[PDB]
Design a binder for these strands. Structure first.
Ligand SMILES: NC(=O)c1ccc[n+]([C@@H]2O[C@H](COP(=O)([O-])OP(=O)(O)OC[C@H]3O[C@@H](n4cnc5c(N)ncnc54)[C@H](O)[C@@H]3O)[C@@H](O)[C@H]2O)c1
Ligand SMILES: NC(=O)c1ccc[n+]([C@@H]2O[C@H](COP(=O)([O-])OP(=O)(O)OC[C@H]3O[C@@H](n4cnc5c(N)ncnc54)[C@H](O)[C@@H]3O)[C@@H](O)[C@H]2O)c1
Ligand SMILES: NC(=O)c1ccc[n+]([C@@H]2O[C@H](COP(=O)([O-])OP(=O)(O)OC[C@H]3O[C@@H](n4cnc5c(N)ncnc54)[C@H](O)[C@@H]3O)[C@@H](O)[C@H]2O)c1
Ligand SMILES: NC(=O)c1ccc[n+]([C@@H]2O[C@H](COP(=O)([O-])OP(=O)(O)OC[C@H]3O[C@@H](n4cnc5c(N)ncnc54)[C@H](O)[C@@H]3O)[C@@H](O)[C@H]2O)c1
Ligand SMILES: Nc1ncnc2c1ncn2[C@@H]1O[C@H](CSCC[C@H](N)C(=O)O)[C@@H](O)[C@H]1O
Lengths: 211, 255, 255, 255, 255
RNA sequence: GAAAUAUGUCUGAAAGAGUUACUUUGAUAGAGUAAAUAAUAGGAGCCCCCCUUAUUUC
């Protein structure tokens, strides 16, 4: 038949995602992954954490309005950075995200930072487009409740949690969600999506249905 | 409106030409689909109604286009508009170092013959057939609407021949707009971007979703009805001449 | 169909703006002639009818445009379209060696302020109002049609400031079409050629007749009704975005 | 050969202007860096040699440009070239619905005044000095080379004001090329793409690296020495006039 | 510098190609004049020196260009630059109502084949030949410089086929630049205006004087030496790619 | 003092759909090469009950 374009769609898709991420780095909304929980995580916990960060940044890279992901407090010599570099390889220096050793409090006004943690009492009414959301990268196999909060309060930041029960019938399950799930939820809320659509990324085993 | 206007539409059995013919016939005009014999355009002409006729022709052939124009004149006695929507596409790299593969000359030649030589052949013959029209109030005897592509400006990899033909159309839009100005014929060109026609819809749905996302706004593949609407707007406006209109939704084709 | 659409037309008390307002109001749309207090646009608003109102504003001033937009929102509740037709023309050579006269920076600054700065100010202040709207079936929240000139492509002698402002509009059509693409606001531009309107009163009558004879086809000054027709066609078509359309009649301005 | 010429380079204390001054002085010509007093161009004038001098002036102020041109004439008694490279860049979205933030008009006015109004002020005030020159054997009295951007053709998101100013420069290139044609001054524009100069200090490092990787070939940030080389080539070619040259490396920007 | 480079110049036996060959060989390069067997190019190749060799080839024929490039490799061992200066012109109106005369399709096809198809054939074969070259310090394996005309942008009456071919070259300049970007071949286009070549010298002195008066500056027919200078400047600049340069002296061809 | 479920991408009896990196892809990339995934919250003896961990019924 007659073909208009060469079959080079993967290269073109990656290039377009790069262009969009380059624009987002300038005019996008910051999203922070606070890499400061190296002490708590074990070896396998850190392996997932890195894997979930990879999947999350992949989801945000393909969005229609990508965030500007910040990897704040990412110690250069720590195991988080080591594993991130090992996993990304030559791409770690081409990723369009801000990876910085300075705590998020050093990059944004303290009045525009909300640390997302289920242990917080305040619920996330609506997704605000003038705020920064801090998603503490973590995997709590050995539960240490009030960690992300305790550190959020230590830094003197506001805290919030997703309205999981207000829109779902959780019954029994772990309220904490994987970093990729959280970023997908926040990308669905950032695109005029209602909580019903946003919370569809929760695992089905954790809830019987919506309310 | 366009009531009583007779339009000769090349490539009218599919995609943009078919949409143009549909809109013009539905607005009360007359259409003469001018496509290849095996284009299945007879069914489209039958569906459109009595105001529409089908003439099996090859734009690259002088005799076939002459016969199509003669059929149009016999059926309707007048040609008031021409729409050169007949074209083909070919994607191939000028040279691939890794594969050691070089662009074939036959591909380039046939792309030029269909997209560029056929367009000019139809333009000249329909201009000849439009000189017999009595000038209207404004002295205008007809409107010729070519169809370039945004490639003509920012063609991608592997779009050398297609971009060459479309750029030729864009370049020759104004010389012919001045050639036929004494006659009163108007020559315009439309450079559509990504449009939802059989040229792209046949691609995998992932590819089509990507192409849709590429458009800044509207974030979707173009609607052939929009091309027909632009063609009608060009037909109605007497002061649109010798210009190329990018109907692409702000998309600048990616490298 | 443009029934019910609310259009804010700047410089709508004269020439192209008034023609656009007349055509839009004549088809059910609402109009807000955003014009200078002394332009006598209130009489034109009264003539047009109740659907049209007059906003005395200077586009170079933020407060005046804000007041006009507030008036439009209060009267009609929406701003579904914007037309930037408010501008001035100044003819002055860059440097005249024989007469030892150098273009005054004041004239250049004034021309830019009225044309380019004014158009950008209107665009930026109406983008908010059009973004508070709710997207229709297709995501659109409005359309903006700027008035560049063919002086932005082939400018004549003693036309440096005018060409600078119009080239600025032409260049910034696409960046602004990409800034507002997420919202759904289309941003088009029209580069009219020679049109019969008060802007040509400065030129000598013999020069005007010569220029009108120089248009390839139709060999006459463009009718403002044709500019209004093109504006309406741009509003109707949802796939025309980030593009400049030369409504000049194929005239290319020689030195 | 460019030996013995005198070139007034605005914004010559940094980036492309400094590279042009370096190349011209090394080739033998004189140089007058017409940069801001706080730009630290005096150090560059000392480093370049006795041929080059530093003229502290603001292109947006007529008196400052007049004083700088008078200083150039006093020191070297001739002005054969004028290189307008003085400009600034601003990245701000026209409207940000999500944040409810609209482009400030002061930013647009600042960018326009610095780039477009400044370039025209320099052009008009140096055309007087270049009109006193005795015409060369070919009839040329001087060359004015403006600096534009590919943003003038396709700007990206948050580039409305910069794109407007550069598009104004591009548009007025030809009108001024025709204004000064009788007195033998050639006006040319250069539209660089991405270059490794302090102007990219605002951009994030990863954004700069990505944009550099996105140049088809050479796939890296442009070298200011290449801009200086093209400026010299324009100076040495008497048949280049009223044209914009995209020195971008084939990169076409995207939103 | 251009010392040692091997340049394949098509249509170098006469006109702009001959001027380019003269300048390149004078600077120390090598030249392969690729023109018609009955063109007198053997005498020019003998005159230029041992560095210049004439290869009789028809650009529209793949075999002839392959043989010419093989001869170039045998004599000089490589191809470092290509200059597509071969082309013809035709004067013919699309349709003359008074004379009842229609443009011949043979003339359009012949002009297309010689200009656009010939340029593409040479471009692709030269890309194949130059891919084998080892990348230089900047990674560049060669340069390709096409000749367009201002007919591609501002075409005149009775210039449909020439304008179509030059517009095709302008359109394909960027797609081929992106095709060959990974290899390292730079593709550029030059759009000369009026030049004192046999294409114009053979005309009567009256029309030549008129044309010399038409150009705003320099008020003369272009000097082929200036085309050669621009070609050398393009060869020397490593960051000029995928761009069209109008070397026409600010003349905009009137209808 | 007794009872519960308790899948770090999701779904699950192995497996399927997803994730990351590199392939300039001739129309099946509808894919290859390499990362990540092979004790179901942490560990033990042998699916089976044992303590701890986050919830929840008297
Ligand atoms: N589809 C797009 O997105 C797109 C974008 C830009 C430009 N274009 C151009 O728009 C035009 C419209 O085509 P389309 O998109 O509808 O594709 P299409 O294949 O549906 O339409 C092309 C039509 O041309 C006819 N045709 C082909 N060769 C012919 C010949 N030699 N003689 C007579 N008829 C012939 C075909 O039978 C068909 O009816 C084409 O020239 C296309 O290249 C298309
Ligand atoms: N007249 C032509 O043929 C022609 C050709 C090309 C472009 N244009 C452009 O088209 C537009 C239409 O102008 P026209 O031809 O109708 O001339 P016009 O003078 O009739 O229209 C210009 C209008 O702008 C208004 N205006 C000027 N400054 C204003 C300000 N600060 N605030 C508010 N209103 C202001 C005037 O009052 C007037 O109503 C102008 O921008 C003109 O430059 C005109
Ligand atoms: N940097 C790029 O890649 C790029 C691309 C396209 C265009 N440009 C244009 O090239 C020009 C050179 O910029 P650059 O890249 O060298 O960055 P730069 O900041 O080094 O150059 C700007 C220069 O202009 C001077 N300047 C600024 N405002 C001035 C004023 N009001 N009066 C006098 N001097 C003033 C500055 O002191 C500085 O020397 C700018 O006009 C820029 O817009 C640059
Ligand atoms: N003369 C101008 O002012 C002007 C302006 C714009 C563009 N051009 C283009 O510049 C180019 C140079 O033309 P010129 O002005 O030197 O005139 P010219 O006639 O001297 O150059 C044409 C050359 O091409 C050769 N040639 C023609 N057909 C050939 C073929 N099939 N195979 C091989 N060689 C062939 C001829 O033998 C001749 O040497 C042409 O392509 C022309 O279209 C010229
Ligand atoms: N229900 C919820 N509400 C808000 N943030 C949540 C959440 N579930 C997960 N997150 C986010 O996802 C991250 C990984 S979950 C790890 C939770 C751990 N207890 C802690 O101290 O944070 C959390 O740190 C938090 O940023």
């Amino acid at each position: 038949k007659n073909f208009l374009f060469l079959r080079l769609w993967d290269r073109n898709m990656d290039i377009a995602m790069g262009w969009k991420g380059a624009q987002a780095m300038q005019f996008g909304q910051p999203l922070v992954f606070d890499m400061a929980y190296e002490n708590y995580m074990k070896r396998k916990e850190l392996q997932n954490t890195v894997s979930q960060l990879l999947e999350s940044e992949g989801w945000n890279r393909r969005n229609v309005d990508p965030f500007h992901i910040y990897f704040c407090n990412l110690k250069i010599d720590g195991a988080l950075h080591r594993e991130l570099v090992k996993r990304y390889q030559e791409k770690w220096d081409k990723l369009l995200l801000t990876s910085t050793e300075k705590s998020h409090v050093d990059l944004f006004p303290k009045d525009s930072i909300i640390y997302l943690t289920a242990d917080s009492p305040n619920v996330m009414t609506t997704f605000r487009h003038d705020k920064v959301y801090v998603i503490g990268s973590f995997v709590d196999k050995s539960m240490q409740p009030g960690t992300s909060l305790a550190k959020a309060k230590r830094l003197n930041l506001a805290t919030e949690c997703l309205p999981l029960d207000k829109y779902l019938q959780w019954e029994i399950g772990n309220k904490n969600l994987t970093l990729d799930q959280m970023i997908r939820i926040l990308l669905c809320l950032k695109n005029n999506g209602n909580w019903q659509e946003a919370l569809q990324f929760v695992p089905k085993r954790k809830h019987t249905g919506f309310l | 409106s366009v009531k009583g206007l007779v339009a000769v539409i090349t490539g009218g059995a599919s995609g943009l030409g078919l949409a143009t013919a549909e809109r013009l016939v539905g607005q009360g005009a007359s259409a003469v689909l001018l496509d290849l014999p095996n284009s299945g355009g007879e069914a489209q002409a039958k569906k459109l109604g009595n105001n529409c006729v089908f003439a099996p022709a090859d734009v690259t052939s002088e005799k076939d286009v002459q016969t199509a124009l003669a059929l149009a004149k016999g059926k309707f006695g007048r040609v008031d508009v021409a729409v050169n929507c007949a074209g083909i596409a070919v994607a191939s790299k000028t040279y691939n170092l890794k594969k050691g593969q070089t662009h074939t000359l036959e591909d380039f030649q046939r792309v030029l013959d269909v997209n560029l030589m056929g367009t000019f052949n139809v333009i000249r013959l329909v201009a000849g057939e439009m000189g017999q029209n009595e000038p209207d109030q404004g002295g205008q005897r007809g409107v010729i609407i070519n169809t370039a592509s945004v490639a003509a400006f920012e063609g991608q990899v592997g779009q050398a021949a297609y971009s060459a033909s479309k750029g030729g159309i864009v370049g020759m839009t104004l010389p012919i707009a001045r050639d036929l100005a004494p006659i009163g014929i108007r020559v315009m060109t439309i450079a559509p971007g990504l449009f939802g026609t059989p040229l792209l819809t046949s691609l995998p749905e992932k590819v089509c979703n990507f192409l849709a996302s590429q458009v800044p706004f509207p974030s979707r593949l173009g609607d052939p009805a929009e091309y027909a609407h632009l063609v009608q707007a060009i037909i109605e406006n007497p002061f649109l001449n010798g210009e190329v209109i990018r109907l692409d939704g702000a998309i600048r084709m990616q490298p």
